[PDB]
Tab-separated table of C-alpha atoms in Angstrom:
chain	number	residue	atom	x	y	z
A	1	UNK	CA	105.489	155.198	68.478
A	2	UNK	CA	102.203	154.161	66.880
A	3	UNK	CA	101.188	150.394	67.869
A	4	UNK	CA	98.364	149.077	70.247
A	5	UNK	CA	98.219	148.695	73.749
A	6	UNK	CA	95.460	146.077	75.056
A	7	UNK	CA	94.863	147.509	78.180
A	8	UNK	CA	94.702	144.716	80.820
A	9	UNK	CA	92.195	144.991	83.603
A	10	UNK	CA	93.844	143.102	86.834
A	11	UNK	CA	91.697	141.085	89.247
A	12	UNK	CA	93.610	140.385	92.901
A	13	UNK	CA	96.608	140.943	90.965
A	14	UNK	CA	97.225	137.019	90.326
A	15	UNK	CA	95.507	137.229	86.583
A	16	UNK	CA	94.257	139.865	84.169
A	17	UNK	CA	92.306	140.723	81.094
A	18	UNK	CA	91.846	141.634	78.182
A	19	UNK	CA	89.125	142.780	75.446
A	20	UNK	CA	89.662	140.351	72.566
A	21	UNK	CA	87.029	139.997	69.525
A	22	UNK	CA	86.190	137.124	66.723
A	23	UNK	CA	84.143	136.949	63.643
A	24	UNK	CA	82.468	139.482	61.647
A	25	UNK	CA	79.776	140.864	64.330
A	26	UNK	CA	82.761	141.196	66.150
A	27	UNK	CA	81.696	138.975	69.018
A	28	UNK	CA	83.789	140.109	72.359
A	29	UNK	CA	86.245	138.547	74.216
A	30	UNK	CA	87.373	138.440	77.948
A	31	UNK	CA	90.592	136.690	77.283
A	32	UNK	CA	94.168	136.074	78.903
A	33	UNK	CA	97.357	137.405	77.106
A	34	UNK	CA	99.154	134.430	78.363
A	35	UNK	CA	102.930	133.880	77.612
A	36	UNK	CA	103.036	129.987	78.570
A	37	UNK	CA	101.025	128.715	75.664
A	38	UNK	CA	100.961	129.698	72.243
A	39	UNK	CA	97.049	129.190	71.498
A	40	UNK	CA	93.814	130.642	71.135
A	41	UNK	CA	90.801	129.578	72.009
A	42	UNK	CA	87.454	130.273	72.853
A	43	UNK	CA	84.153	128.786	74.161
A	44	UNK	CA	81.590	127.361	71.399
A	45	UNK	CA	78.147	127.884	71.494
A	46	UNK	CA	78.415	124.021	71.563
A	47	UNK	CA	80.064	124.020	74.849
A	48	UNK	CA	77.552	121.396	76.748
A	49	UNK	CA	79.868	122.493	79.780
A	50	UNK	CA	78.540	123.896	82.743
A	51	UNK	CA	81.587	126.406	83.037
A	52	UNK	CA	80.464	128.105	80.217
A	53	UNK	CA	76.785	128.769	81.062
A	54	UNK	CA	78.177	131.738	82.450
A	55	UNK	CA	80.106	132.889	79.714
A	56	UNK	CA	80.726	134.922	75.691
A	57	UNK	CA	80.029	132.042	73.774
A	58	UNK	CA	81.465	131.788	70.356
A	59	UNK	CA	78.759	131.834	67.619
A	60	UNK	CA	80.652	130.876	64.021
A	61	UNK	CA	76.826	130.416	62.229
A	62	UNK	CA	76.749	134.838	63.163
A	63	UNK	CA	80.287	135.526	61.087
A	64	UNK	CA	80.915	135.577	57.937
A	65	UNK	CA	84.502	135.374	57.771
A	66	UNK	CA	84.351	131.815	60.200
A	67	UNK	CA	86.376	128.793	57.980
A	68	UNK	CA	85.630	125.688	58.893
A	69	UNK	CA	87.842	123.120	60.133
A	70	UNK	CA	86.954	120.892	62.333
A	71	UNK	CA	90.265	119.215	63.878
A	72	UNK	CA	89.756	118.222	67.120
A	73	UNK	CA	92.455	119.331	69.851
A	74	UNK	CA	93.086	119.492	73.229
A	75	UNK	CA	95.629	122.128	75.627
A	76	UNK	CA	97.022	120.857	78.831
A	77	UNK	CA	97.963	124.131	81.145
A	78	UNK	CA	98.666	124.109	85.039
A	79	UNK	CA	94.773	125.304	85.689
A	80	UNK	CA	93.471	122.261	83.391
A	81	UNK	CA	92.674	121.034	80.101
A	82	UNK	CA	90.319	122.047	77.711
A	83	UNK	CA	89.181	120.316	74.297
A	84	UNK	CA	87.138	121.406	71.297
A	85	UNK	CA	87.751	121.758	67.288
A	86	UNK	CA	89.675	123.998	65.148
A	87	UNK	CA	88.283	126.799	62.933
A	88	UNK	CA	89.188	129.555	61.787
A	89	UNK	CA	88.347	133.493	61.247
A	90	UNK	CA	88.927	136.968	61.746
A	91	UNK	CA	90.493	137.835	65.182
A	92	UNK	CA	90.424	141.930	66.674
A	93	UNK	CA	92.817	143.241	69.458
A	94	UNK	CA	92.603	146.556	69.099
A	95	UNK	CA	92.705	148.862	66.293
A	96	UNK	CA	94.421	145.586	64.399
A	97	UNK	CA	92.597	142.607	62.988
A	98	UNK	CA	94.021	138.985	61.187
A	99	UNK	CA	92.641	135.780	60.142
A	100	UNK	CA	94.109	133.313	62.979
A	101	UNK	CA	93.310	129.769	63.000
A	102	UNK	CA	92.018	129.226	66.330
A	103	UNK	CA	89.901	126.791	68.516
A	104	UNK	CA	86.676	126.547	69.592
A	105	UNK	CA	86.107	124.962	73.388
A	106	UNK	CA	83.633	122.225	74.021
A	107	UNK	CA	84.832	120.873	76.753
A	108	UNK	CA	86.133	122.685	79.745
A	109	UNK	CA	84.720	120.497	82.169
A	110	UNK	CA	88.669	119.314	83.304
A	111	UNK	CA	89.575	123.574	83.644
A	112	UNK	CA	87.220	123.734	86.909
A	113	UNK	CA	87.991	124.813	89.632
A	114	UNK	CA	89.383	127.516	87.733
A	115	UNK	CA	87.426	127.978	84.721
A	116	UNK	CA	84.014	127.986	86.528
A	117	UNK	CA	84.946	130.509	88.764
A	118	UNK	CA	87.103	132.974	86.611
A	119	UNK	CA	86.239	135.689	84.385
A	120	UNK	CA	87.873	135.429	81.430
A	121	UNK	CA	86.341	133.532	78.118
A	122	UNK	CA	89.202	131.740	76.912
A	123	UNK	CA	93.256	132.428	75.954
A	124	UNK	CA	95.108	133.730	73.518
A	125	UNK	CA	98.745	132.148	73.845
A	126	UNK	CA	101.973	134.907	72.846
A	127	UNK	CA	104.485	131.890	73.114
A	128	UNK	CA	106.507	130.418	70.377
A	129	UNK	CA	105.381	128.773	67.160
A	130	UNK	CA	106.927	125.280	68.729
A	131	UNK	CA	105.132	125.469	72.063
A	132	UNK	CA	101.835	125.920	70.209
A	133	UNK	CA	99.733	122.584	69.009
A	134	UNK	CA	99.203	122.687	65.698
A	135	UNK	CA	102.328	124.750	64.597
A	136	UNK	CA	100.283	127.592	64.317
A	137	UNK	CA	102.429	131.054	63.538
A	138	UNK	CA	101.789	133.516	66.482
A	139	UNK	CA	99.061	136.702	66.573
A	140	UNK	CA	101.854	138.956	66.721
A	141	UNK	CA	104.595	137.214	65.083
A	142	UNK	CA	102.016	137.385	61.637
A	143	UNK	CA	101.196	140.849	62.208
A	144	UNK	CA	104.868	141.534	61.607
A	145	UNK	CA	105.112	140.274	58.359
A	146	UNK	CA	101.484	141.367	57.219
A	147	UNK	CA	103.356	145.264	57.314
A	148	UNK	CA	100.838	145.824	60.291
A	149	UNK	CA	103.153	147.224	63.268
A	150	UNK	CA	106.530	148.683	63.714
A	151	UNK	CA	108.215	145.922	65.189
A	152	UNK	CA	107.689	141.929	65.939
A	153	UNK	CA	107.288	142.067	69.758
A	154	UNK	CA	105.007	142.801	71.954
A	155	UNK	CA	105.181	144.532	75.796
A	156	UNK	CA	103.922	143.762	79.471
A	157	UNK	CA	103.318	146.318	82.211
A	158	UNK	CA	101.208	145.221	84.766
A	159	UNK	CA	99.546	146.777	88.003
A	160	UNK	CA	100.209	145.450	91.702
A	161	UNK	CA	96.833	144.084	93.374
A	162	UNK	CA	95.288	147.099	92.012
A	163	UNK	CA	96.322	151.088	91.964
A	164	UNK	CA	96.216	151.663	87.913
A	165	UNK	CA	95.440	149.449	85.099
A	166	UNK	CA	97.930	147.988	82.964
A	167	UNK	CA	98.897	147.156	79.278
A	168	UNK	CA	99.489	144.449	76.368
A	169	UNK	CA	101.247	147.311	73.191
A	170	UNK	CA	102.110	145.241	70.218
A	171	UNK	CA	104.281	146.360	67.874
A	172	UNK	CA	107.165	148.611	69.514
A	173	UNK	CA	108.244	149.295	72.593
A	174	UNK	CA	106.769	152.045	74.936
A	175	UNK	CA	109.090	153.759	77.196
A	176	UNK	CA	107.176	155.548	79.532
A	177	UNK	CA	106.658	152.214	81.005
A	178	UNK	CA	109.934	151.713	82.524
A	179	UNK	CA	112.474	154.026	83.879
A	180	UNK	CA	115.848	154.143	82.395
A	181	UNK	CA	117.803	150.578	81.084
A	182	UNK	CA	116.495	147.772	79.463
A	183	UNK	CA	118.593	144.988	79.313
A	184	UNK	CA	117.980	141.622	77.197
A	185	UNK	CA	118.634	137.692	77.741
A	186	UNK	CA	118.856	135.393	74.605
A	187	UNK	CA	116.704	132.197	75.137
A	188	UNK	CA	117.672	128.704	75.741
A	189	UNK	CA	114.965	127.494	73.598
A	190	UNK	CA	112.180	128.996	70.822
A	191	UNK	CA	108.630	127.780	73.311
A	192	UNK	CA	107.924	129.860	76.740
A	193	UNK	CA	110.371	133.462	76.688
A	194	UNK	CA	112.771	131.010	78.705
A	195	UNK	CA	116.267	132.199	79.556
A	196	UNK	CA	119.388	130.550	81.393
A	197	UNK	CA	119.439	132.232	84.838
A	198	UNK	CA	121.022	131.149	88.283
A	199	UNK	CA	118.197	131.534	90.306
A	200	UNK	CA	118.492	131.735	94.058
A	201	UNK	CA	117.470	134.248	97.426
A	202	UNK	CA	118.994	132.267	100.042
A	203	UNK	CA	121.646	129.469	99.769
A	204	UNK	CA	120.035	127.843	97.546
A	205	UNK	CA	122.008	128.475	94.178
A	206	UNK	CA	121.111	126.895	90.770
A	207	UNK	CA	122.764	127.289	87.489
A	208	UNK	CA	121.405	127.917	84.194
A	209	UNK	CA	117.939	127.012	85.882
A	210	UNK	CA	115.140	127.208	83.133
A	211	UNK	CA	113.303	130.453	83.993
A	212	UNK	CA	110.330	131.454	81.785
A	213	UNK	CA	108.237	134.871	82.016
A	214	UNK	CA	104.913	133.738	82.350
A	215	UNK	CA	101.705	136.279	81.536
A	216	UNK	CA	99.811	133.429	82.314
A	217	UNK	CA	101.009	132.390	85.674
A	218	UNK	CA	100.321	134.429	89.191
A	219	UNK	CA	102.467	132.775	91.171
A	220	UNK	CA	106.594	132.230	90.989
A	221	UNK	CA	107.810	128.600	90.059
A	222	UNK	CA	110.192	126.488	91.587
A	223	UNK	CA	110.196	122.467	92.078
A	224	UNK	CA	109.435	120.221	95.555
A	225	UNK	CA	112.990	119.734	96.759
A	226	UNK	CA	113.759	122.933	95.778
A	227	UNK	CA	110.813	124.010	98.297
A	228	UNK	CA	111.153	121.145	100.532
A	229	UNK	CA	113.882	122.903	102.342
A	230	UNK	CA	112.060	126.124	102.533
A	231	UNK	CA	110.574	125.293	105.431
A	232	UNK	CA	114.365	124.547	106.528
A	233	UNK	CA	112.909	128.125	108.078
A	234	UNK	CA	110.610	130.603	107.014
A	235	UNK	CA	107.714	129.525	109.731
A	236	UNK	CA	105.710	129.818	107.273
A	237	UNK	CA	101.546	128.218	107.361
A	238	UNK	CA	100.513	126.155	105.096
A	239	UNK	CA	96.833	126.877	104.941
A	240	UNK	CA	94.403	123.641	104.265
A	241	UNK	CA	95.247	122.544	100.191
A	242	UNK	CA	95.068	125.006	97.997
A	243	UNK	CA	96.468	127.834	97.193
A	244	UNK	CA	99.715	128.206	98.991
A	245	UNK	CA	101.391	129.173	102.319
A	246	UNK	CA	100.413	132.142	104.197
A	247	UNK	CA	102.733	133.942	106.313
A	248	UNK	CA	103.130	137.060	108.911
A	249	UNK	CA	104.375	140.002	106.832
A	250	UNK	CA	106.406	142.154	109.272
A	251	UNK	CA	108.433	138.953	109.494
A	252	UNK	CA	112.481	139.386	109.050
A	253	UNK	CA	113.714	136.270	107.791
A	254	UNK	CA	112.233	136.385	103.686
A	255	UNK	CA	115.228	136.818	101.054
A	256	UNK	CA	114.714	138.703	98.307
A	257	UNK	CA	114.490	136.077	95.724
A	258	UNK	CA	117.862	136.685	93.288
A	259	UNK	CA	118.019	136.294	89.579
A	260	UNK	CA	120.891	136.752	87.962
A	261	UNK	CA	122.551	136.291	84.155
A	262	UNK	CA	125.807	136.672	84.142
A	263	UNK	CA	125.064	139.919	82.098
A	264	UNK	CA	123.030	141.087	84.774
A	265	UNK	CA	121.327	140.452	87.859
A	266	UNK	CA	117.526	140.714	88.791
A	267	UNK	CA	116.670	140.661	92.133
A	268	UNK	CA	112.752	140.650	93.669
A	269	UNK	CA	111.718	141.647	97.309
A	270	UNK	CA	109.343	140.554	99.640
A	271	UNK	CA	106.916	143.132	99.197
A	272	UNK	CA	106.189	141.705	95.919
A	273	UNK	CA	104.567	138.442	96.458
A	274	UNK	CA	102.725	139.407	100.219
A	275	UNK	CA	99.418	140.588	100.874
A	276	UNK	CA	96.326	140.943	101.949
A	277	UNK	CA	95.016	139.007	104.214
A	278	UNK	CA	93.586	142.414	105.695
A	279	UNK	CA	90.069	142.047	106.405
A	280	UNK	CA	91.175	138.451	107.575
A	281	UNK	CA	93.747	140.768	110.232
A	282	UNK	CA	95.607	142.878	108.019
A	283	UNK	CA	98.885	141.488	110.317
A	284	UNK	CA	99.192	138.234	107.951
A	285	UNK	CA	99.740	138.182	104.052
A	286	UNK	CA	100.025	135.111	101.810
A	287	UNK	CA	103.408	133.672	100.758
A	288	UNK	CA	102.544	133.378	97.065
A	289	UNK	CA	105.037	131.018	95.899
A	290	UNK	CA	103.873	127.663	94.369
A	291	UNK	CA	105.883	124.299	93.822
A	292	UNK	CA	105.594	123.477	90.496
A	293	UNK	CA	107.165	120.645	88.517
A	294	UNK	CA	107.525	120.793	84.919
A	295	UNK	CA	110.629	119.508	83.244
A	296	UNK	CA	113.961	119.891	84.766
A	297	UNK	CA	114.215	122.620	87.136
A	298	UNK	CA	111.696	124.929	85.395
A	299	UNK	CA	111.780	128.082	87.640
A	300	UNK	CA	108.092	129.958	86.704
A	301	UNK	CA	108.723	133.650	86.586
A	302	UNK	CA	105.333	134.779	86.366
A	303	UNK	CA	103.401	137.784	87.570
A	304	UNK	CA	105.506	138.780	91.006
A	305	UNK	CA	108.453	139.223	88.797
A	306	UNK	CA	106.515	140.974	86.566
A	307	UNK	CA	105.070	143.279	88.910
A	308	UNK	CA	108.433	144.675	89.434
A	309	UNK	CA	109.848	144.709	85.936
A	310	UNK	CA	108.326	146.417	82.848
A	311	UNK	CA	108.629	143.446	80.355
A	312	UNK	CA	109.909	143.279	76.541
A	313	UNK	CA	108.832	140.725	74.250
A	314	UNK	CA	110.468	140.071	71.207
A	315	UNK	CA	110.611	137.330	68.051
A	316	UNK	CA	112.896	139.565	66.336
A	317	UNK	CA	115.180	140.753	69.459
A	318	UNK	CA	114.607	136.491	70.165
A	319	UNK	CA	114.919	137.334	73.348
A	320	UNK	CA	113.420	139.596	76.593
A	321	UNK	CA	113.202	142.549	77.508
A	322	UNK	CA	113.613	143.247	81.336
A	323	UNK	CA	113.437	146.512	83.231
A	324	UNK	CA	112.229	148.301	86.371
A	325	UNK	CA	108.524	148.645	85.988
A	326	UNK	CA	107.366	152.640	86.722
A	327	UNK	CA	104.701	152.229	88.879
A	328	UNK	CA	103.678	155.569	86.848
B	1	UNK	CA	95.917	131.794	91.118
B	2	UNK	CA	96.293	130.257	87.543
B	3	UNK	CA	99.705	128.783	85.870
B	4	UNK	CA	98.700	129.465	82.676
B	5	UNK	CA	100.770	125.671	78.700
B	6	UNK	CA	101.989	122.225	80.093
């Protein structure tokens, strides 16, 4: 059915992109349909930051429709902070447009290494109302009640390390992006999609274990001593700091990590989070799977499960939609 | 990579 469908444009499959627009001249936007934050933002021509020398620049004094504000902010993600001042105007994804009260960057500076070396401008959050600072009513969840598109939820299909492109369709829910069922989990709580899942691939069982579908994230998410013992085998490298372990990919030993509700069960395969590492003797690929420690046992479910399943968002559902991606 | 809110 008629909606929108932002098509995302992958880069080394851990983060993709999308064509976003502000302001009356319509100034362009590489930004980040991210699910773990629940803001928008965007460089201002007032940036002083060196990570946005290369970069769209906001320009409010060039639209007509830009409200001032003022507020300062700031928005603490995994990558970094950034910090800047609200204001407010007309927003564009697509063939839809809204006035969204967003914020303009001035400092990034605390973003780097990331930032600096990325491609994308700023974010544009798809979380919950409560997750967002400033209690500021979600892009899609205002489209909704503005009579703009079919449904409140939006939909994730993504590529894997390249092959096709993939998309962001607001509104309803596309079916020739999964094959067959489509099952849904309620939510735990109204700020990341979160569900309560028993996550676990070898004997290492958890229940209710937060476990949030992240946009936003490339890598999967569990904590330290949940990881500690995954060295209990796995001979797995650990690469100087940063990013993560790298590993030999005809291995035998890897589990196929295993979600499951008691509804139903979701289960994810090696193949998903391995590779390259091909130039650099296409016999090793890298581990992808970062220890990460939020609050509790917060499991992030980010791209890698996402590259599998064709993903549902919904305020309205409250809940997600889950399903065998169609690599078609 | 990123992990996109904290």
């Amino acid at each position: 059915s008629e909606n929108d469908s932002i098509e995302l444009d992958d880069v080394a499959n851990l983060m993709f992109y999308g064509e976003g627009q502000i302001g009356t001249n319509k100034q362009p936007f590489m930004f980040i349909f991210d699910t773990g934050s629940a803001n928008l933002w965007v460089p201002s021509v007032n940036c002083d930051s060196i990570g946005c020398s290369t970069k769209h620049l906001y320009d409010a004094s060039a639209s007509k429709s830009y409200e001032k504000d003022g507020t300062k902010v700031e928005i603490s993600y995994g990558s970094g902070t950034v910090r800047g001042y609200f204001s407010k105007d007309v927003i564009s994804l697509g063939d839809l447009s809204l006035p969204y009260k967003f914020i303009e960057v001035t400092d990034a500076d605390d973003l780097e290494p990331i930032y600096s070396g990325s491609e994308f401008d700023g974010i544009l959050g798809l979380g919950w109302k409560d997750l967002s600072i400033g209690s500021i009513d979600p892009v899609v969840v205002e489209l909704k009640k503005q009579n703009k598109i079919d449904n409140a939820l939006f939909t994730f299909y993504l590529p894997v390390h390249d092959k096709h492109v993939g998309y962001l369709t607001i509104g309803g829910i596309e079916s020739d992006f999964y094959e067959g069922p489509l099952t849904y989990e309620k939510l735990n709580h109204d700020l990341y999609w979160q569900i309560d899942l028993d996550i676990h691939f070898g004997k290492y069982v958890m229940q209710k274990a937060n476990a949030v579908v992240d946009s936003g994230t490339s890598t999967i998410t569990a904590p330290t001593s949940f990881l500690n013992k995954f060295f209990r085998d796995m001979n797995v490298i650990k690469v100087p700091f940063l990013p993560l372990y790298v590993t030999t990919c005809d291995n035998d030993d890897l589990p196929t990590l295993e979600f499951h509700s008691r509804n139903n069960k979701y289960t994810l395969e090696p193949e998903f989070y391995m590779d390259p590492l091909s130039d650099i003797d296409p016999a090793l690929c890298m581990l992808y799977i970062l220890p990460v420690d939020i609050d509790d046992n917060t499991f992030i479910l980010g791209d890698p499960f996402m590259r599998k399943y064709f993903t549902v968002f919904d305020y309205e559902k409250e809940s997600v939609g889950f399903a065998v991606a169609k690599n078609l | 990579x990123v992990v996109x809110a904290x």
